[PDB]
Design a protein around this ligand. Structure first.
Ligand code: XJ7
Ligand code: XJ7
Ligand code: 6IY
Ligand code: 6IY
Ligand code: NA
Lengths: 626, 80, 79, 77, 80
């Protein structure tokens, strides 16, 4: 076999002129085991395909002629690798990947299989290995490498047309694969969008009854749901406002024009599978994503979504939010009043007197414990319904954890109260303190205070932690030095000296708080060094760093606030606690009224008005009444 | 935001202490306000049980209001 | 000149060790001033913990900024 | 602080580089695993008939334009 | 501290016969959009006279581009 591989590798047909003679004399064919690499299954056709110059290699035609003469072409052309790293790759894949139209045409003409799946480890999705995923099919391979002519040929050839709705081992179709290769750069977004559009038009022309975009992969995701969950901002933006001005396929659009006067026109957005789909909607996918998605905070700025969220807020959610805020304020006022008037006798529980104040006090206590139980079960319901991971409990969901911890302090206080312990007071005040700081949760619902609260969060998580690590190291070091110098004093302990040196930070430091030492100069030098390092350097540096940080988080803070309000809107819409279900957005309007068959479309559209003072063109309206 | 934090921690502290000279909402609010102007005490009373709770509350108040919020006000004014 | 302009951490760790050895020498000479040496070493021993902030990106960059603030702004102010 | 961001990052990277080189020089156990990777056949054709090996470092790249056929060393990916 | 010349030398690639061996950057394989490159590392981390990393790291503090030279392409990844 080495002579054949050498001849095809060098592209020298003169070495194989006697091939068919001795093959016929020996009664052998090129697809027998003796002409294949035992380790990989590589054959002479594949070697000829891999090596060529300027798209030309003449040995391939010779091999095809010899194979046709010996037995047949079906077993020779459709040879493939048999290892576990290039499994299923054949000559058609190589022809497409090499960007050679002629070889693809010749391979298809001689009976190549246009549904062969190349499912080796190289061609699958993985992190710690090289590879390139394209959906395993030659149609997906041609689509994902920006070769429009080859997909047109593969779909429209007479010898074997390709199956446009084929699915790989994961279940991805061509459109799933096109979503998968996007990476939110400019040129990639441009070509991915163009190829998506062309495949939709061709699929509509060839199969008018086929709905490609409804096909789901093994995870149950359509291409739009996959684009939303993976954070593909460009593909989502393209899909949600898609407009196709072409007869016989206008029903594929998702943005329509309803009417137009001179400068003013009205557009309709499709809104199907955005807020109601009963499988996995776009808003649920974006809002409840797992914090590792790249463009999590930016995806809600795509055009229809921001407006429909503002519409939901203005229509019915705002009043419910204000009602919840009012009820929480009443709860905290009652809790404060009940805790303020606690009795000061020993050993609870305390016997009630037949007097008015005791009745009001015990009623307040009952209401406080009731609210604690309520927030406890709300926390459990959150954890079960969302099923967050270990990472998500720390990098996300701060408010849920804070409200849950408040309820835990309340319940431990109840347990200690009925166990005859005065330490229940130690629990209660902590709950009370947390109860007031959680009032800042309601700053969302107002734009300026919500953005301000997001900025407070980012200051705590970025600047304060870095400050406090270095500060605590310096404080502990100088405290140990100073307490070691002191001998037989009042202070002479780590806690007292730590407190005394902490007092310098708040503008209350003494510099002469003790004299129980020998070596005054050592004491003064240590205190002056501490004061210079922490007070004059580090605090002013914290101010400077916060000033740097606040300049950079404006737009990010606004986007995070909008995501917070979106989560609030979705939770209120889901729960609603009054049996009401008036949660549809806009009218059930007729868009075109001409599907491919005689029926007419109604599609739950959302209306937006626009004004333009240039490009006085005529639009294809739906109605003549403005 | 500042008045919300001040009222919350004042209610917690005045609930903790008992019997004498600061067992009143006005006096404790004034004592915790003094931290903002650079005159806070940290040992202004001993009429309690649970010293560690008292110290933890005061340190949390000081970290949240004095070290975070005032310097943030300076930063925001510089932005404005 | 690179001793003054470069290699600060080597100088700081070496000065810490010098305070320790002077403390030992004073200790065995029946002097109480060994305490005066020892605490200085102890103080330096904690601040040199900042050497290990390299190895973490955010804390390493923060420590470099501290170093530049000390060398640029604090000197002019203190003069 | 507004000026020294990039300079601070570069100085930190130089500090970590010095740490890496000192750790390599000390090495603590007479181990050779600190050595660089991949003694690969590079071109295998010097001006003489001999072949060459070079201890190379591999880096992967992706480019969504200029679909040219690069002159690789091997046909197996 | 001649950073431009260093950047040129470390990723040099010459595409012509009889001069391929002069390159220091090579292409190992390429699929459609993906390709894999090789960098030389000869005399970067082991030469026994003066390697690039030792020369840059232990420089004399007066080199004009002391801190920027480690951003040249192979060296940052090698150190990581
Ligand atoms: C003893 C006394 C204790 C004092 C405690 C003082 C707390 C002050 C805070 C008051 C409570 C405010 C609140 O309710 O929590 C805030 C943040 O609070 C913090 O700063 C934590 C400090 C640790 C809301 O965070 P949120 O739950 O909305 O999560 C956001 C996601 O929705 C979004 O998708 C993104 O993932 C985004 O990164 C997330 O932010
Ligand atoms: C009681 C007494 C307390 C004294 C406390 C003093 C402050 C804390 C010090 C904590 C230790 C931090 C540390 O480890 O030291 C810092 C230096 O901090 C100072 O500036 C102190 C000024 C005096 C690291 O500097 P480094 O040695 O790493 O040198 C870098 C080179 O590598 C690089 O090539 C460049 O040349 C670069 O310009 C250099 O930086
Ligand atoms: C930015 C933060 C700055 C912090 C500065 C002050 C705190 C420094 C504490 C570190 C040193 C170790 C503490 C050891 C505890 C201890 O063993 O000392 C205990 C003290 O108990 C406590 O109050 C616990 C306080 C817990 C506070 C936790 C934040 C009893 O000593 P007393 O003098 O009070 O009573 C005896 C009177 N005859
Ligand atoms: C930036 C804000 C900083 C807050 C500073 C502290 C003030 C907040 C007080 C809120 C708590 C409720 C006040 C209750 C008033 C009250 O009932 O207390 C009154 C006090 O009267 C007053 O000075 C009126 C104060 C008017 C408040 C003008 C903002 C009498 O108590 P005395 O101890 O003085 O006398 C008692 C003699 N046995
Ligand atoms: Na003061």
């Amino acid at each position: 076999r080495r002579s054949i591989f050498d001849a095809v590798a060098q592209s020298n047909c003169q070495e194989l002129e006697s091939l068919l003679p001795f093959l016929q004399r020996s009664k052998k064919r090129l697809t027998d085991s003796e002409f294949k690499d035992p380790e990989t299954g590589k054959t002479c056709l594949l070697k000829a395909m891999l090596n060529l110059h300027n798209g030309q290699n003449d040995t391939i035609a010779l091999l095809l002629d010899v194979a046709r003469k010996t037995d047949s072409l079906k077993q020779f052309v459709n040879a493939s690798y048999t290892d576990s790293y290039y499994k299923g790759q054949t000559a058609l894949h190589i022809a497409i990947e090499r960007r050679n139209m002629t070889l693809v045409t010749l391979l298809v003409e001689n009976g190549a299989d246009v549904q062969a799946a190349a499912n080796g480890d190289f061609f699958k999705k993985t992190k710690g290995r090289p590879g390139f995923y394209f959906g395993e099919l030659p149609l997906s391979l041609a689509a994902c490498t920006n070769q429009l002519a080859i997909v047109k040929f593969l779909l429209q050839n007479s010898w074997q047309p390709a199956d446009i709705s084929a699915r790989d081992s994961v279940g991805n179709t061509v459109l799933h694969a096109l979503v998968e290769v996007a990476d939110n750069t400019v040129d990639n977004t441009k070509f991915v969008t163009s190829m998506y559009n062309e495949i939709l038009i061709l699929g509509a022309k060839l199969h008018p009854t086929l709905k490609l975009e409804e096909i789901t992969n093994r995870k149950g995701l359509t291409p739009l749901a996959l684009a939303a969950s993976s954070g593909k901002i460009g593909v989502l933006a393209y899909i949600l406002q898609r407009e196709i001005h072409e007869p016989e396929c206008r029903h594929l659009s998702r943005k329509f024009t309803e009417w137009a006067y001179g400068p003013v026109h009205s557009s309709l957005y499709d809104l199907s599978c955005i807020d109601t789909c009963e499988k996995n909607s776009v808003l649920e996918v974006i809002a409840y994503s797992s914090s590792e998605t790249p463009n999590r905070h930016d995806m809600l700025l795509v055009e229809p979504l921001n407006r429909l969220l503002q519409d939901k807020w203005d229509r019915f959610v705002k009043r419910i939010f204000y009602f919840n805020f009012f009820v929480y304020c009443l709860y905290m006022i009652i809790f404060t009043a009940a805790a303020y008037y606690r009795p000061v006798e020993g050993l609870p529980p305390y016997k009630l007197k037949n007097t008015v104040g005791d009745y009001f006090r015990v009623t307040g206590e009952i209401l406080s414990v009731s609210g604690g139980v309520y927030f406890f079960f709300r926390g459990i319901q959150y954890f079960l319904q969302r099923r967050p991971s270990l990472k998500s409990l720390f990098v996300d969901s701060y408010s849920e954890i804070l409200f849950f911890v408040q309820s835990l302090f309340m319940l431990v206080s109840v347990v200690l109260y009925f166990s005859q312990r005065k330490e229940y007071v130690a629990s209660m005040v902590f709950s009370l303190a947390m109860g007031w700081t959680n009032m800042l949760y309601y700053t969302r619902g107002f734009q300026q205070m919500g953005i301000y609260a997001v900025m407070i969060e980012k200051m705590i998580l970025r600047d304060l932690c870095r400050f406090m690590f270095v500060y605590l190291v310096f404080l502990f070091g100088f405290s140990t030095a100073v307490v070691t110098l002191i001998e037989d004093g009042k202070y002479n302990s780590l806690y007292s000296t730590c407190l005394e040196l902490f007092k310098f930070t708040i503008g209350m430091g003494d510099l002469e708080f003790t004299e129980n030492y020998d070596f005054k100069a050592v004491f003064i030098i240590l205190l002056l060094a501490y004061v210079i390092l922490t007070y004059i350097l580090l605090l002013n540096m914290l101010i400077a760093l916060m000033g740097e940080t606040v300049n950079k988080i404006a737009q990010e803070s606004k986007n995070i606030w909008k995501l917070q309000r979106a989560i609030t809107i979705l939770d209120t819409e889901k729960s609603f606690l009054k049996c009401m279900r008036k949660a549809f957005r806009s009218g059930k309007l007729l868009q075109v009224g001409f599907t491919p068959d005689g029926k007419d479309d109604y599609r739950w559209c959302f209306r937006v008005d626009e004004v333009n003072w240039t490009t006085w063109n005529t639009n294809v309206g739906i109605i003549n009444e403005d």
